[PDB]
Design a protein around this motif. Structure first.
Motif, mmCIF file in Angstrom:
data_model
loop_
_atom_site.group_PDB
_atom_site.id
_atom_site.type_symbol
_atom_site.label_atom_id
_atom_site.label_comp_id
_atom_site.label_asym_id
_atom_site.label_seq_id
_atom_site.Cartn_x
_atom_site.Cartn_y
_atom_site.Cartn_z
ATOM 1 N N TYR A 50 73.563 69.979 -34.077
ATOM 2 C CA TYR A 50 74.486 69.057 -34.754
ATOM 3 C C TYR A 50 75.896 69.652 -34.712
ATOM 4 C CZ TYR A 50 70.562 66.563 -37.139
ATOM 5 O OH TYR A 50 69.421 65.864 -37.445
ATOM 6 N N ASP A 51 76.902 68.794 -34.902
ATOM 7 C CA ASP A 51 78.324 69.216 -34.960
ATOM 8 C C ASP A 51 79.209 68.081 -35.504
ATOM 9 O OD1 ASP A 51 80.495 70.965 -34.734
ATOM 10 O OD2 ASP A 51 80.608 70.860 -32.553
ATOM 11 N N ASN A 52 80.425 68.426 -35.942
ATOM 12 C CA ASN A 52 81.352 67.453 -36.550
ATOM 13 C C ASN A 52 81.789 66.387 -35.551
ATOM 14 O OD1 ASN A 52 81.486 68.654 -39.212
ATOM 15 N ND2 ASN A 52 82.836 70.225 -38.352
ATOM 16 N N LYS B 216 80.035 64.394 -33.802
ATOM 17 C CA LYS B 216 79.144 64.331 -32.641
ATOM 18 C C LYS B 216 78.036 63.368 -33.002
ATOM 19 C CE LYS B 216 75.988 67.374 -29.985
ATOM 20 N NZ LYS B 216 75.750 68.805 -29.637
ATOM 21 N N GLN C 190 67.830 56.571 -46.329
ATOM 22 C CA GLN C 190 69.179 56.717 -45.711
ATOM 23 C C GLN C 190 70.245 55.820 -46.347
ATOM 24 O OE1 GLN C 190 67.891 59.060 -41.770
ATOM 25 N NE2 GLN C 190 68.521 56.951 -41.336
ATOM 26 N N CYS D 111 74.101 57.023 -46.066
ATOM 27 C CA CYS D 111 74.909 56.972 -44.821
ATOM 28 C C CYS D 111 74.854 55.598 -44.157
ATOM 29 C CB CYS D 111 74.485 58.080 -43.852
ATOM 30 S SG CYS D 111 72.712 58.165 -43.567
ATOM 31 N N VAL D 112 75.232 54.597 -44.934
ATOM 32 C CA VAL D 112 75.179 53.213 -44.485
ATOM 33 C C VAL D 112 76.202 52.997 -43.352
ATOM 34 C CG1 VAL D 112 75.462 50.799 -45.177
ATOM 35 C CG2 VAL D 112 74.352 52.435 -46.733
ATOM 36 N N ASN E 14 78.499 65.299 -40.121
ATOM 37 C CA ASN E 14 79.549 66.136 -40.693
ATOM 38 C C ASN E 14 78.922 67.179 -41.633
ATOM 39 O OD1 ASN E 14 81.958 66.845 -42.549
ATOM 40 N ND2 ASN E 14 82.910 65.621 -40.920
ATOM 41 N N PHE E 15 79.267 68.456 -41.424
ATOM 42 C CA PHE E 15 78.664 69.580 -42.171
ATOM 43 C C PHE E 15 78.877 69.509 -43.689
ATOM 44 C CE2 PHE E 15 78.401 71.841 -38.033
ATOM 45 C CZ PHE E 15 77.106 72.326 -38.137
ATOM 46 N N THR E 16 80.037 69.008 -44.111
ATOM 47 C CA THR E 16 80.384 68.932 -45.535
ATOM 48 C C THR E 16 79.614 67.801 -46.223
ATOM 49 O OG1 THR E 16 82.317 67.505 -45.115
ATOM 50 C CG2 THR E 16 82.690 69.892 -45.132
ATOM 51 N N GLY E 17 79.701 66.607 -45.644
ATOM 52 C CA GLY E 17 78.971 65.444 -46.143
ATOM 53 C C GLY E 17 79.516 64.141 -45.594
ATOM 54 N N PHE E 18 78.924 63.040 -46.044
ATOM 55 C CA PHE E 18 79.327 61.708 -45.603
ATOM 56 C C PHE E 18 80.398 61.121 -46.520
ATOM 57 C CE2 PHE E 18 74.766 61.999 -44.251
ATOM 58 C CZ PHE E 18 74.996 62.019 -42.879
ATOM 59 N N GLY F 247 72.853 62.652 -48.987
ATOM 60 C CA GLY F 247 71.969 62.763 -47.816
ATOM 61 C C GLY F 247 70.465 62.893 -48.047
ATOM 62 N N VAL F 248 70.047 63.226 -49.267
ATOM 63 C CA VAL F 248 68.612 63.297 -49.597
ATOM 64 C C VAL F 248 68.212 62.236 -50.646
ATOM 65 C CG1 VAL F 248 68.151 65.646 -48.808
ATOM 66 C CG2 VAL F 248 69.041 65.322 -51.116
#
Ligand SMILES: C[S@@+](CC[C@H](N)C(=O)[O-])C[C@H]1O[C@@H](n2cnc3c(N)ncnc32)[C@H](O)[C@@H]1O
Ligand SMILES: C[S@@+](CC[C@H](N)C(=O)[O-])C[C@H]1O[C@@H](n2cnc3c(N)ncnc32)[C@H](O)[C@@H]1O
Ligand SMILES: [Mg+2]
Ligand SMILES: [Mg+2]
Lengths: 379, 374
Positions: B60-62, B64, B166, B169-170, B176-180, B236-237
């Motif tokens: 994973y990556d920002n 991407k 989910q 993350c609609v 993104n590593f930080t969050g949505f 995310g969870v």
């Protein structure tokens, strides 16, 4: 604190291997165990792990309503809870998925002021997803009890997965040790013909119960379910999977509200996620190596970790105690009773590790275990 | 015909404790392990069980696309399969429930001629049933991905359970590593208001990830989800549970064909709006309980009657993957090498049929597979 607790756990479907580590540890720690399982190896295994067990299966009988049996099963468990004992109930699969007496016993225990918890397990539907190679995500999943499906006229969706439990006892409220006379099965077949048509596939699924067995994954037409030698294969451990008949159109107004495409553009209809559902009627296999896929694979040769990637960097003392909290129910109880005192009892933790354990907060434990310069979306 | 295999397994949701005995044993036996989990104690545990592991999360990556990451994950696993090795992939929860790369890797390996299998695990939906105290049987369960639910206008059923994955993350395709920034969440809330009404309950569910944590089981109204301080708790969870509006009436034509009568089960769903208390001890319940005093085992009940040797080998086949591989290669040879089995036990094991093993391990009085507790 009032003495007495009820923890209900599962064993999964395939003998022994599908039991969770926490189900096993709670079985071993229990003062009394009540179990209802349907293969002998799993029963023998439980009897090695606790020496004060009762087999709940003996409360079924020929011609007896299953509702009477369920009231009896639940009362046997709660009677021991009322004596102040730590009791564990055990049901095959997931103990709360198509299981009546577990919910009843836990609700009674909770109403009377006792500690009460269900630990999840691996169900027959979990096995179905694994063995039939489908994901409930694509294109959604409807799950029903077969008799309820008919009696309450539950709606089908021809564009999503359908899963039907208890297809081997349609309209049957009692029990027999040898097997069911499933002579109302034709009423189910009629409903399926009406909704899907005579030539649509129905998959007869039986998950393997022994570790060396293969699963049953036999495709039949809705019409073929009226043949006798095929109908008699459907028994007490049979589930049906009915795949989608067609693909539902995308809503263009939603696509624009979500900003997935600008105004004036329409989705690519001939686009699918690999792999195709193997059970759907007349649907071709999707290409696994599109040009965009081939470009992603090229980037592997180069690839190194991103700057924001957080590698694991913990200690033996920290990893050991976190493992212990998951595998030793008594250590967990002690930690919950007093975080500080437990944290001070553990040898060799660093100041940051001890403090993170003293707090107990998720952010803290992650900081203590990862090199820093909760997101798990694989769907 | 061909050397090399792929087995994909899960770890469950709550750290370590929710791994199955077979997922653990396959991880230990593997030549190479690839994993994607989301808490550090499970990661550390996996690394103590096999010397040759690779973390898939690094792909994973920002900014991407998650799609590109999934193709890379699947290809890394199948590359080691092509080298003739026994490979294990590990995903948190159930590895086939809202997981793209597992299905992809298994389908490629199968099409190329290698052995390929998924072992089921405990999902977030399994945890939800346990923690919210509901059964999918009563009154049925619909399960959707939240974005797909909107885009393909998937039908609701107001008389059944609804579960949405989910929700954090609609309409979001990238990582993104930080969050949505979940800024299209309002489109989801609008559909729920249209289908259920502004005052209908929605339960925000997060299963405990660490063994000492409590689950989040917070009940809101649909309208409350528009409030900024409430919306930002959805991450995310997070999963949503939406209970039924009411109870659907029975169909008389079908009741007649099944030959039934022309009575709610305890306990009632605690989340459903305006449902009354059901009595746990009705007259019929009290009479069932009175019968426990004089109860004896039924005539046709078949008590377990086995041996230490037979129980041990059946346990071994479930916990030792190489022993299972040996047995499947040659039933006779394997059964002959097991010490202290009876002639009946050895012949039953040589056959391997369910009827044979069940006869060997039980007393059959003057053969059923019948587990209907629903
Ligand atoms: C009373 S329920 C119990 C289900 C169990 N608690 C679970 O988690 O799957 C019985 C029903 O479960 C399903 N079932 C049980 N064993 C199965 C198997 N080995 N393969 C497929 N379905 C099974 C069938 O639909 C059966 O009628
Ligand atoms: C990519 S999927 C993976 C699901 C996973 N394979 C499983 O078996 O549940 C991610 C979604 O799973 C659900 N999820 C993951 N962890 C969860 C938790 N601790 N509690 C509730 N839902 C969770 C959420 O809906 C989340 O957006
Ligand atoms: Mg439950
Ligand atoms: Mg699957």
């Amino acid at each position: 604190t009032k003495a007495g607790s009820l923890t209900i756990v599962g064993t999964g479907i395939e003998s022994i291997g599908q039991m969770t580590l926490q189900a096993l540890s709670y079985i071993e720690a229990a003062a009394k165990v009540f179990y209802c399982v349907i293969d002998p190896a799993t029963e023998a295994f439980i009897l090695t792990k606790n020496k004060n067990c009762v087999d709940l299966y003996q409360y079924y009988d020929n011609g007896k309503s299953r509702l009477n049996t369920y009231t009896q099963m639940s009362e046997l468990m709660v009677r021991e809870v009322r004596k102040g004992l730590d009791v564990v109930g055990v049901f095959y699969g997931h103990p709360g998925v198509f299981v009546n007496p577990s919910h009843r016993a836990l609700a009674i225990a909770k109403s009377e002021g006792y500690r009460a918890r269900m630990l999840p397990g691996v169900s027959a539907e979990d096995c179905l997803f694994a063995d039939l190679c489908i994901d409930p995500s694509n294109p959604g999943c409807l799950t029903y009890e077969a008799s309820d499906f008919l009696i309450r006229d539950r709606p089908v969706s021809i564009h999503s997965h359908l899963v039907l439990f208890q297809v081997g006892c349609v309209g049957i409220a009692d029990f027999n040790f040898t097997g069911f006379d499933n002579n109302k099965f034709g009423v189910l077949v009629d409903r399926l013909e009406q909704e899907y048509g005579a030539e649509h596939p129905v998959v007869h699924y039986i998950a393997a119960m022994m570790p060396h067995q293969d699963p049953v994954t036999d495709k039949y037409t809705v019409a073929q379910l009226r043949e006798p030698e095929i109908a008699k294969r459907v028994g007490g451990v049979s589930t049906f999977y009915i795949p989608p008949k067609a693909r539902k159109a995308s809503n263009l107004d939603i696509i624009r509200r979500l900003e997935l495409l600008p105004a004036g553009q329409v989705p690519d209809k001939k686009a699918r996620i690999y792999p195709a559902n193997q059970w759907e009627p007349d649907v071709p296999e999707v290409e696994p190596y599109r040009p965009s896929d081939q470009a992603a694979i090229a980037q592997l040769a180069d690839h190194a970790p991103p700057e924001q990637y957080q590698p694991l960097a913990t200690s033996k003392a920290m990893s050991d105690v976190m493992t212990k909290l998951a595998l030793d129910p008594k250590a967990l109880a002690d930690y919950k009773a007093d975080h500080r005192a437990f944290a001070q009892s553990v040898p060799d933790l660093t100041p940051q590790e001890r403090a993170a354990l003293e707090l107990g907060d998720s952010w803290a434990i992650r900081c203590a275990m990862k090199n820093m310069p909760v997101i798990g979306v694989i769907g």
